[PDB]
Design a protein around this nucleic acid. Structure first.
Length: 52
DNA sequence: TCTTAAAATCGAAGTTAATATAAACTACATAACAGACATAAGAACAAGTTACAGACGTATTACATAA
């Protein structure tokens, strides 16, 4: 899931902004891990809003 | 031909009843819930249509009375 996060982060990276890649990629990989663990870690799915 | 790691097995009942750690905001579309209306289905009353019952009235016969 974090790997998918990297692919999506690379697809929309901007180096005009001058920040390093790790800072932007960490956020997207965080989102990947959290969304996947909210959607697929239970036998009975609990919607994302109820997860938060 | 000789090690060496794997693979498989190891009695019946009986009873037994589980746990417990570890992003937020925003935007949009969809489903659900409630209310009102129209419709189809049933309940109620009343009427009409029809034949039969129940006792009366009639018709018939036989006995009694009158000539």
């Amino acid at each position: 899931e974090g790997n998918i996060g990297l692919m999506k982060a690379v697809d929309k990276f901007e180096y005009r902004r001058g920040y390093k890649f790790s800072t932007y990629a960490t956020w997207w990989i965080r989102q990947a891990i959290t969304r996947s663990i909210a959607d697929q870690a239970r036998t009975i799915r609990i919607p994302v809003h109820m997860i938060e």
